[PDB]
Design a protein around this ligand. Structure first.
Ligand SMILES: *CCCCC*
Length: 12
């Protein structure tokens, strides 16, 4: 599953 969207959205 893609982490990219999660990384971008919450952390960054
Ligand atoms: C591809 C996600 C890199 C961190 C924003």
């Amino acid at each position: 599953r893609p982490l990219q969207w999660l990384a971008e959205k919450y952390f960054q």
